[PDB]
Design a protein around this ligand. Structure first.
Ligand SMILES: [Ba+2]
Ligand SMILES: [Ba+2]
Ligand SMILES: [Ba+2]
Ligand SMILES: [Ba+2]
Ligand SMILES: [Ba+2]
Ligand SMILES: [Ba+2]
Ligand SMILES: [Ba+2]
Ligand SMILES: [Ba+2]
Ligand SMILES: [Ba+2]
Ligand SMILES: [Ba+2]
Ligand SMILES: [Ba+2]
Ligand SMILES: [Ba+2]
Ligand SMILES: [Ba+2]
Ligand SMILES: [Ba+2]
Ligand SMILES: [Mg+2]
Ligand SMILES: [Mg+2]
Length: 1032
RNA sequence: GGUGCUAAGAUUAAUCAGGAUGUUUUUGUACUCGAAAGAAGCUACAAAGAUAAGGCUUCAUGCCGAAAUC
DNA sequence: GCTCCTTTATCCTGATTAATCTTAGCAC
DNA sequence: AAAGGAGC
């Protein structure tokens, strides 16, 4: 029997076939949408955002306790919030402030303490006075030109400003001690080291340094260093360690071939020669082996991308011999390997200093020698940033001798010396998508082996190329052209800056991305492609903050993190671009060149790549909800791990189940060669792909039989499906929009109602204006201004709609719908609120009554005159009951937001009383029998009692709170329904809108839960237990 | 075809430290109404508060909450 | 009650560790 | 993609 596997990011196709007969024994499709674990990006983003906001709020709490302890303010209730803190930040610079005015000035400073990778207050206040606003990024007029500002300042300048304030206060006030000044500046300027992370000695967290086990790490990334290829409980050596340098050159030398393999002695010559000579390269070493022992006679050396020969040259050692306050020759091996550990992993003074103190014996270093090691590590980031060797040192020491003694390379030597736990298999893998699909692929083969015994062969499709030589040469030419323009960009940055042919290592400190910034910089003709302005190398390197690397098509939508989706632009031009493509954004941007100019530049030049040109000019209105390379990387990763784990399992246990490999491009043409047809948008193709995989393996060796069986029209209608149920609570609970509500009468009601508000963020975009007219043609009274400012609406905005075009002839002589608000803007500036003396504020956003408040989460401030809510509440599970009096089913729906952390306990749970309240409000009778609980992707069987039809569905959720017992379902064999698809008569047909929403509380109904193993074998469940499971 | 070491070129993953926003509440100022006191809560700016629902203990460079465990 | 229709926050700056392909040079 | 009020 032969087992095929098509492992993917959200599916694994399974299929078995009796090799002699060619008969199909099992076909199956295992599904687990990869979108669930791909959301980890959202989880990390939100965890990090919460930490930034937690600490910003903690900064002003820490400031409160500082003012309390100093005895300057005890009562924080009478603290005004309507004075100008920016002006007191200027007054305090020279004149005396009240303690309340000082606390307002410093609290304002702590909430915007600037970047750290005329004082700021005076720059901010001047923007307050001359343009009426300071925050965010906005446009300002600059003598005919529009310029862009943003409230971003160095933390150094904020600290500089605050210091002058408090020192000036000190001469007026004595309660302001030197310690008070010290403690505040740490509140203001304090940051955590990136290699420490969260926590404190009492606040244990395994995200950071203070581990819950009680251990305190020096650097939280040390534990992430890889393990040895053969010693899984041994960390690997630094590239710059002595052990790894000796192993590297030793194996380099034996892989040469010489007229006289080199002898044992012959290597120690070269090792000593290169170790004690200062300058060393590949030629000059070979120039020594040849001209001192014919370089053309030596062969078997690894070659450059370009074609230069290369070899290991103890580069790390030579540089470490240059140290003046220490002598590398005076240190033994494990001390020099340990030194390279510390200097590879740590990039900061304190991290190195702490690691030296805690890993070496107390008398091992002096301050001056750690002082030199600090300056040394920074000056050689290019060497200690190269990472780690694939081997531990332990293994190399069991290998370096025998590489001296014998002429064999590492592969040759290791030969000489000589069911799957899916969780341990994926214990140390930090990619939840790869870790999941691997875990799914192994759970299957274990169940396949249980039901069938071992197999002659288990075949895994791989996505590796097979290329002929024209093509192969076709890859290195490109990979070499890639390395060529980086050098070309660096060389050019060097001459433009230094005039020399190399940039000083001083410029890359705290700015390792410069090598890439320069590369895109060179590709954009040294011009920012949104401003049309030149980017001077001096400005870039010398003033790095003025620029940012924009994702051309924003990553929120595309997830395309390649170079071809990146451009170096001025920072303000990237912030104004926002979550938009240049096409959507450029013409609307105030400080920017026209999209036409950008088009011209892009087509005109010979610097941008082919794919970079499409992305900069796609007039495609891409969107986040329109019906990626991570998929390819992770599929390769998952399939591989499964393969290796299978081979190694069948040797260490000697099962002699062969394990073969097939490539995707071969299966694709085979499927074309055979009579294989793919059903549109269906999960069937994962299964039959796996049978093409199993079949590929027995090709050398009933063949037509298998195919005919396969071709059978009747074949698909009996392929099995199994889905991974999701029981997890505490997923994303709702949409993020925070909604206001008001009491109003809208449309057909004559009783005040609670309406959720909506708002048009900017009426000067086309999307902003089209939204305006949809609401306008339907019911102008929806706009809150219509009701609360009819003068502005009737005497400003209605004339504008009347007297400005809503369309226009474009560049191409094609009528395009234009925006009357926008066309007024270009002429008179912003539409302004109605006023007698032309004094009204500008108009940018319009709130309107949207929809009636229904289901929601209440986040209402005690302060608020109206409720504030969150909407689109996501569901967790549905509890199925049955009422004997009515003979109908009653379905209770639980949402993530029904569970919470219990005060006091800290347990995440729902209580019976709340569960009983939900049970009531959902129409479940308190005297009704519990039947089962359905989670997402569980499967249902819905039977009609009267006509005996039955349909198998998978569960999604309980939908529509108002419509009791209503449930959204999904298909058994595909991702979604199309719409109008016929179901059993009781449920009619699925809504043409696509979503299958049916109520299951009708009399004529029968529903059972269906479990499957990962193979597709179904079990009918008609009752699970006496009561629902609520163990927490 | 699998695999080991090395180097490069491409992609991507996990995790940490920070910035500036956005949403909404309240207040102030402006705009509108009013003789003012104020009203209205639109519109703009500023400040203060909340920012997945919600929790923790050790009182702080405090900690956890959208993944995985099926 | 059953189906149609609208709706849905984001841009960056530092840093480390790991993976998978694809070329190369050697090899079981 | 799916919540759920709008719309009838
Ligand atoms: Ba803005
Ligand atoms: Ba020396
Ligand atoms: Ba590195
Ligand atoms: Ba080919
Ligand atoms: Ba909107
Ligand atoms: Ba939603
Ligand atoms: Ba190979
Ligand atoms: Ba007045
Ligand atoms: Ba007044
Ligand atoms: Ba008021
Ligand atoms: Ba704010
Ligand atoms: Ba909270
Ligand atoms: Ba109704
Ligand atoms: Ba809605
Ligand atoms: Mg961008
Ligand atoms: Mg649809």
């Amino acid at each position: 029997l032969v087992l095929g596997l098509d492992i993917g990011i959200g599916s694994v196709g399974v299929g078995i076939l009796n090799k002699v007969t060619g008969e199909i024994i099992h076909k199956n499709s295992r599904i687990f949408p990869a979108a669930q674990a791909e959301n980890n990006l959202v989880r990390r983003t939100n965890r990090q955002g919460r930490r930034l906001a937690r600490r910003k709020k903690h900064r002003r709490v820490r400031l409160n306790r500082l003012f309390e302890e100093s005895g300057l303010i005890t009562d924080f209730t009478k603290i005004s919030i309507n004075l100008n803190p920016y002006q007191l930040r200027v007054k305090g610079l020279t004149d005396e402030l009240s303690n309340e005015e000082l606390f307002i000035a410093l609290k304002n400073m702590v909430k915007h303490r600037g970047i750290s990778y005329k004082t700021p207050g005076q720059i901010q206040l001047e923007r307050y006075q001359t343009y009426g606003q300071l925050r965010g990024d906005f446009t300002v007029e600059k003598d005919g030109k529009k310029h862009r500002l943003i409230n971003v300042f160095p933390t150094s300048a904020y600290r500089s400003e605050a210091l002058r304030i408090l020192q000036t206060q000190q001469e007026f006030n004595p309660q302001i001690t030197d310690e008070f000044i010290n403690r505040y500046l740490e509140i203001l300027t304090g940051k955590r080291k990136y290699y420490h992370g969260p926590g404190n000695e009492k606040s244990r967290t395994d995200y950071g340094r203070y581990r819950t086990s009680g251990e305190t790490l020096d650097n939280i990334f040390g534990i992430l260093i890889g393990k040895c290829t053969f010693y899984p409980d041994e960390f690997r050596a630094a590239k710059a360690s002595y052990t790894a340098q000796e192993f590297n050159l030793l194996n380099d030398l034996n892989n040469l071939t010489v007229p006289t393999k080199l002898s044992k002695e012959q290597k120690n010559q070269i090792i000593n020669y290169v170790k004690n000579e200062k300058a060393m390269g590949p030629a000059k070493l070979f120039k020594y082996i040849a001209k001192l022992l014919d370089v053309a006679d030596i062969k078997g050396y690894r070659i450059d991308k370009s074609g230069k020969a290369e070899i290991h040259t103890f580069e790390a050692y030579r540089k470490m011999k240059t140290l003046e306050t220490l002598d590398i020759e005076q240190m033994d091996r494990e001390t020099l390997d340990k030194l390279a550990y510390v200097l590879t992993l740590n990039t900061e003074r304190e991290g190195i200093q702490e690691a030296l103190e805690h890993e070496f014996a107390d008398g091992s270093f002096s301050q001056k020698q750690v002082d030199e090691l600090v300056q040394f590590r920074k000056a050689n980031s290019s060497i200690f940033g190269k990472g780690w060797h694939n081997f531990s040192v332990k293994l190399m020491m069991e290998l370096i001798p025998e590489l001296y003694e014998t002429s064999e390379e590492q592969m040759t030597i290791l030969t000489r010396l000589g069911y799957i736990d899916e969780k341990l298999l994926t214990e140390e893998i930090y990619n939840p998508v790869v870790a999941k699909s691997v875990r799914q692929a192994i759970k299957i083969v274990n169940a396949a082996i249980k039901e069938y015994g071992d197999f002659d062969n288990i075949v895994i499709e791989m996505a590796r190329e097979t290329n002929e030589d024209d093509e192969k040469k076709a890859i290195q030419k490109i990979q070499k052209a890639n390395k060529d323009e980086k050098d070309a960009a660096m060389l050019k940055a060097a001459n433009q800056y230094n005039g020399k042919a190399e940039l000083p290592h001083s410029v890359f400190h705290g700015h390792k991305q410069l090598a890439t910034k320069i590369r895109l910089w060179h590709q954009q003709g040294e011009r920012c492609l949104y401003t049309g302005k030149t980017i001077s190398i001096h400005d870039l390197i010398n003033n790095s903050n003025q620029f940012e690397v924009d994702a051309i098509l924003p990553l929120s939508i595309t997830f395309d993190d390649s170079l071809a989706n990146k451009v170096l632009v001025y920072a303000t031009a990237n912030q104004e671009k926002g979550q938009r493509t240049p096409y959507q954004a450029l013409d609307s941007m105030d400080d920017a060149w026209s999209f036409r100019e950008l088009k011209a530049f892009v087509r005109e030049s010979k610097t941008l790549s082919n794919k970079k040109k499409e992305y900069l000019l796609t007039e495609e209105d891409i969107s986040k909800f329109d019906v990626i390379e991570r998929n390819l990387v992770d599929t390769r990763y998952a399939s591989r791990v499964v393969l290796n784990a299978l081979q190694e399992h069948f040797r260490a246990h000697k099962i002699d189940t062969k394990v073969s490999v097939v490539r995707g491009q071969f299966t694709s043409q085979l499927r074309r060669h055979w009579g294989i047809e793919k059903t549109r948008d269906t999960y069937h193709h994962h299964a039959v792909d796996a049978l093409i995989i199993a079949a590929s393996s027995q090709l050398n060796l009933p063949y037509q039989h298998f195919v005919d069986t396969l071709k059978s029209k009747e074949f698909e209608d009996s392929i099995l499906f199994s889905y991974q149920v999701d029981s997890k609570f505490n997923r994303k609970i709702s949409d993020a929009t925070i909604y206001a509500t008001r009491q109003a009468k809208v449309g057909k009601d004559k009783a005040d109602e609670t309406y959720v508000l909506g708002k048009i963020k900017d009426i000067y975009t086309q999307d902003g204006y089209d939204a305006f007219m949809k609401i306008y043609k339907k019911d102008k009274s929806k706009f809150l201004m219509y009701r609360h400012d009819p003068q502005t609406f009737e005497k400003v905005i209605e004339p504008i709609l009347e007297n400005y075009p809503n369309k226009q002839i474009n560049e191409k002589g094609k009528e395009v719908p234009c925006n009357p608000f926008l066309k007024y803007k270009e002429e008179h500036g912003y539409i302004r609120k109605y006023s007698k003396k032309g004094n009204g504020p500008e108009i940018k956003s319009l709130k309107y009554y949207d929809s009636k408040l229904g289901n929601h989460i209440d986040i209402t401030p005690k302060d608020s005159n109206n409720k504030v809510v969150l909407q689109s509440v996501s569901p967790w599970r549905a509890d199925v009951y049955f009422n004997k009096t009515t003979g109908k089913y009653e379905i209770l729906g639980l949402k993530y937001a029904d569970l919470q952390f219990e005060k006091g306990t800290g347990t995440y749970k729902i209580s019976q009383e709340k569960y009983n309240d939900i049970k009531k409000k959902e129409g479940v009778d308190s005297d009704s029998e519990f039947k089962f609980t359905l989670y997402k992707n569980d499967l249902l069987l819905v039977k009609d009692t009267e006509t005996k039809e039955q349909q198998l569905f998978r569960f999604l959720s309980r939908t529509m709170p108002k419509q009791k017992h209503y449930v959204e379902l999904k298909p058994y064999d595909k991702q979604k329904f199309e719409g109008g698809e016929a179901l059993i008569k009781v449920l009619g047909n699925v809504a043409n809108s696509g979503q299958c929403k049916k109520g299951l509380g009708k009399s004529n109904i029968s529903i059972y839960k269906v479990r499957t193993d990962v193979l597709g074998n179904q079990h009918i469940i008609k009752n699970e237990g006496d009561k629902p499971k609520l163990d927490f």
